Amino acid sequence: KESRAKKFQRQHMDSDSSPSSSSTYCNQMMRRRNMTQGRCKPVNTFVHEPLVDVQNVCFQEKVTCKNGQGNCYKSNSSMHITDCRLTNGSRYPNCAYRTSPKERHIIVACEGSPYVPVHFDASVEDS
């Protein structure tokens, strides 16, 4: 009863929660999202925008992927997100990140049917 896309949602898509995330949000969240299980994540970037939005991206714009195909795409515009990068030389099992409340574009790799983001690449700075 599980799927791939769904995993991506609870992976980077944190819309559920509200903005203004400065506290140890990521520091823990990232770990609570089953991302620090067994090991520690070097970096990450949550999202404060609704999926429906990110999804439209795959239909709004498109971009190249690691392989070199149009498997990737970029949001037609900026989007609320919560930066999350390791800090204090933290390491597994320890995991400390710096929650950075910001809002900008993003690039994700959508696939399958329907066309939804099943992976996250990295956030953008500007158009």
UniProtKB/Swiss-Prot annotation:
Keywords: Disulfide bond, Endonuclease, Glycoprotein, Hydrolase, Lyase, Nuclease, Secreted, Signal. Its EC number is 4.6.1.18. It catalyses: an [RNA] containing cytidine + H2O = an [RNA]-3'-cytidine-3'-phosphate + a 5'-hydroxy-ribonucleotide-3'-[RNA]; an [RNA] containing uridine + H2O = an [RNA]-3'-uridine-3'-phosphate + a 5'-hydroxy-ribonucleotide-3'-[RNA]. One of its GO terms (biological process) is defense response to Gram-positive bacterium. Residues 5-25 are annotated as: Disordered. Coiled coil: none annotated. Glycans are attached at residues 34, 76, 88. The keyword Signal applies. Residues 5-15 have a biased composition (Basic and acidic residues). The active site is at 12 (proton acceptor), 119 (proton donor). GO terms for molecular function: lyase activity; nucleic acid binding; ribonuclease A activity; RNA nuclease activity. It is found in: Secreted. Its main location: secreted. Pancreas and other tissues and body fluids (indicating it may have other physiological functions besides its role in digestion). Disulfide bonds join 26-84, 40-95, 58-110, 65-72. One of its GO terms (cellular component) is extracellular exosome. Substrate binds at residues 7, 10, 41-45, 66, 85. N-linked glycans are of complex type. The keyword Membrane does not apply. Changing residue 39 to D: Substantially decreases binding affinity for RNH1 but maintains high conformational stability. Monomer. Interacts with and forms tight 1:1 complexes with RNH1. Dimerization of two such complexes may occur. Interaction with RNH1 inhibits this protein. Belongs to the pancreatic ribonuclease family. Endonuclease that catalyzes the cleavage of RNA on the 3' side of pyrimidine nucleotides. Acts on single-stranded and double-stranded RNA. This is Ribonuclease pancreatic. The chain holds residues 29 to 155 of 156 of the full protein.
